[PDB]
Amino acid sequence: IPNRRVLVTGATGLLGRAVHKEFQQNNWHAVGCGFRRARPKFEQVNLLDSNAVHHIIHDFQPHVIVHCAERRPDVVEVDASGNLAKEAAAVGAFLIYISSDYVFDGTNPPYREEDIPAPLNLYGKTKLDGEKAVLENNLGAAVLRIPILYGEVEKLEESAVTVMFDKVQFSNKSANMDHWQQRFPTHVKDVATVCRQLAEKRMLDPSIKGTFHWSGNEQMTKYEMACAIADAFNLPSSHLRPITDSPAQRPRNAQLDCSKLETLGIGQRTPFRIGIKESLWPFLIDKRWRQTVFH
Amino acid sequence: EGTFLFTSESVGEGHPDKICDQISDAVLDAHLQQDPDAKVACETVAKTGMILLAGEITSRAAVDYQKVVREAVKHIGYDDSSKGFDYKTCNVLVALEQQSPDIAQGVHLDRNEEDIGAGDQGLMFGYATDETEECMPLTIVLAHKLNAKLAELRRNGTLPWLRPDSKTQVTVQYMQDRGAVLPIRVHTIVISVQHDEEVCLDEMRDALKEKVIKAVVPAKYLDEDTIYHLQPSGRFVIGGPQGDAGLTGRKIIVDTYGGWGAHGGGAFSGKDYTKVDRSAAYAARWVAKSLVKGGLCRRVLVQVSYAIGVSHPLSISIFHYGTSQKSERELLEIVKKNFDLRPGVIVRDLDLKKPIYQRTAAYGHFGRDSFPWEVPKKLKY
Amino acid sequence: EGTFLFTSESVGEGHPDKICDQISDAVLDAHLQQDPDAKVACETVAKTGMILLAGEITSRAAVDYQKVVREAVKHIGYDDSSKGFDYKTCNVLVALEQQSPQGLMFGYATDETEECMPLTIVLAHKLNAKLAELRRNGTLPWLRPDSKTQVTVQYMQDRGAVLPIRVHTIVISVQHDEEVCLDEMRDALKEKVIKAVVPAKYLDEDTIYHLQPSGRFVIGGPQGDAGLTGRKIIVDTYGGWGAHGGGAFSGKDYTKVDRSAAYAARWVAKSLVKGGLCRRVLVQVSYAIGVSHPLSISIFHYGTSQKSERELLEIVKKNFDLRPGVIVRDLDLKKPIYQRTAAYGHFGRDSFPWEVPKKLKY
Amino acid sequence: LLAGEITSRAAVDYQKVVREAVKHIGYDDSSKGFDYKTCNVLVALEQQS
Ligand SMILES: Nc1ncnc2c1ncn2[C@@H]1O[C@H](CO)[C@@H](O)[C@H]1O
């Protein structure tokens, strides 16, 4: 019953399940797609299958598109990324290429919508390649950048924030926790809204593009997150070594700078207290012991 | 992965074990019209030529049993030797007595109505799942609506070669999800259904698939590999009570959750509000739906039990398959505040003296629009 | 906490719905004892003074149904008009249609009792069987055949398994004579019955007793209510625990998967738990059309196994043949036994084959 | 319905007897009130040898 249209790639994965649903609760005709776990909730479309991709962009007629396209760590060490921008630009669809802060060096906070990119790794680099590819194949596209994503997950490994929860629960095991590298948790439910409002605002201004930055205002490290997470469910916190060693590849900070994007009434920030508490209650041991097909 | 298969079945109005469930509920309805305080346990039998009633009834009402039986058999659609059976010419034996004095004195006599005791003892479950809009398992929802679609098309005439006996098994490939279950795709469908002589086998499958299946099942759950066994018997025209043996209450897993959650034994049909096999089973469903719709869990199973001549339940129990943030006691305590589950309060809350039971006789008692127990309570915690 | 309640019920031999179940398998016994390849779907309806037999049969046998019907009723103990029923007078109609020549099954087992059965129904059965025993001694000579029992256990959840902590509520109602006074009966049900049946550790002074809560139970048997075959399937199986696709067992022959595959599913699940691999398990075997072998098998071990489902499944594939034909062979399902199953439940009993664990090479 | 005592060696398909007779008489369709094919046959004979 709504009119103008959105397509969400990687809508099976964590970021995209929020992106798709966040459009589709404020009157949009929303249709996510994915390579794996698509049916029944989303359409089956491989991104590296170049025919199938245009086949659904053609048919549906999406006014706005939002590429997301994982199992987070990694957090140690493409290209149809942009081929999508080619096809998406043709049919007059504003592509929002979600990207990582890891494109940077990580030596001075912050980094601006403008600053020089200098990636230190495999990942960081090829997120840059995607921005070029996307942007030069169509200079009518936003490169909305995000930090580490937590969200309301189905399996822990879906987020580098959440994988830690097992470690946080079991006191009987002690494990260490990274404090050397600074970090920046952000709710996908919030990025879902920044993506939604940077689209409703593509009519109130008919030309927006040229990179965008968005993050959450809550600075932590793997360790500082862990202790918040204990303190949300009220658990023992002290089985957890910090470290300031480099167990040498990653940046040691990046941090984003959301000047431009805050300016137009485009933002949302759920507190990490709640954000994470609402995400990880199903993976309490006692709730896991209770989750079976039969009683 | 956490991928499991699961199958549930339904049957058509004109399957023997559901002819009885339905005749019984007709005799119930009959009595409740002239007398809402009728007590009725009417068990019914269907053999080749025969519908025999047996049971016990206390009811001021006088009822023409010959007419009620034959009118319902007609409604079901058996009217000729062409088909298995025929209300006009069938044997109807009655063996209904007055009810046992020893139950009367210690169940419903001389008592303020909210404190009438359980009709019998026993255990009843009631279950709910966020997997569908109707808070029922996809398997059993799809299964029922196939036999519903079949009968609808039989009656309105677009498929006149249809005949009332049918069976439908629906297997679905499910996935676990933080305690809840997620339907992915319909793995196998089966439909055998009694047919006319004229219509040939290959028009029937072509029909079942485009007229019936496609209408009922959202194309999201179907793909190429979805398997279809439409009329896999072939020679299914000789169908109904003929050759066979029906009984009331031999289809209790179809009558309820298609094999999900749990079931505590009790048959529903032919019984009134004082039989907690029925009343408290509608109530426990009311509970478990109200909890899920009220967002307290995605999935829950509830058990209650009663003792004969004792108004309060002996035990409420809440299993929420780990799908609520609230613990299982927290939900149980909410249920104490918001429900009085004695049989004398349930009758009010759900209007169980109105003669509406013949609707519930087929296609399931749970997960349907009008039914009182399907309207969730706004909960106050 | 992590403390919960759960209730289950059983009925005595004399209950009209169970009378029927015995007679249907009596009639089955009777046919196989001649033609061991008999095909049988024998319903039984019992109501004041009547036993009606219904439904298709195919056999080579000649069965004197009068003999069969009455010998069961005699056994169950209804022999004089005063009890409401008598095998000497009861009318025996017969409507069987003799001749002369798909879905899903569940098994369950639990570590909480010697018999791998949910404690709730174990005790419920034992009470009815204990009554019948005492009736048949003439220790309690004022007993009559029809009875009913319900047992609410207070469990604790523990690492996927369930720990029975106490008996919380017990209900017994049994048909009696018009002589014996009410106190004598409730004082007898407690000491000579319940205290004989239930481990003293599970009983204490808060355990709630409903002994003859009906007040008076003289009229009963096929008189007090109509009785029908296959109307107590949760009493016949796992008492509310586990799961149930919906197969009525009694009066069906071994060629009914509903019954045979059900028994094997139990056999398996019990073997698995008895074999030290699970504390608790549900086993879900789904037969499809055009497959000798079960198409799928799921094993829900409630996380009480040091092994995965795949690991557990593999053990099963290399220990068990669950092709319907093999199951009838492995479990000796042509003996005239079945009448013995139709009372006090099919699972948890040592005389039976499917209750004898296969020792597992893996 | 069949009723009353017999003493015999013969085993007899009462289904068959009762139906083939009801056919020979000519009750063949439920259009006529009765049909050898659809009618109930109850037996209540009390047979020994
Ligand atoms: N007075 C009674 N008290 C308790 N249970 C009874 C009574 N009469 C019959 N029953 C049992 O309950 C069922 C129907 O109420 C019967 O099958 C019988 O076993």
Numbering used by the authors:
A (entry chain F): 15 to 83, 85 to 92, 103 to 272, 276 to 323
B (entry chain B): 15 to 395
C (entry chain A): 15 to 115, 135 to 395
D (entry chain C): 66 to 114
Sentences reproduced from the published study:
S-Adenosylmethionine (SAMe) is the principal methyl donor of the cell and is synthesized via an ATP-driven process by methionine adenosyltransferase (MAT) enzymes. In humans, there are three genes, mat1A, mat2A and mat2B, which encode MAT enzymes. mat2A and mat2B transcribe MATα2 and MATβ enzyme subunits, respectively, with catalytic and regulatory roles. The MATα2β complex is expressed in nearly all tissues and is thought to be essential in providing the necessary SAMe flux for methylation of DNA and various proteins including histones. Here we report the crystallographic and solution X-ray scattering structures as well as biophysical analysis of the MATα2β complexes, providing the basis for fresh insight into this widely utilized system in biology.
